[PDB]
């Protein structure tokens, strides 16, 4: 679980994967990507539930 | 012969004016939503 970057300029929520993240991954497994956004009023909400495969 | 003179006051005339300017600055952009309260996913129904 890592925080993302709220990019004002590109108007996107983005995150870059590093070498550290891959130390806890295995090549081939189909994980699930879940994205949570918290507004000012403290309301956790799931935005995306895509599945990712690191081949 | 007298040659006797007189004396006056120092009288001077000048026109003075001070001016200024004005400029209006505006910054706007097309609306792409807006800062909302309780930004949460929703499921509308009719």
Automatic annotation (TrEMBL), chain B:
Q: Which domain of life is it from?
A: Viruses
Q: State the name under which the record lists this protein.
A: Uncharacterized protein
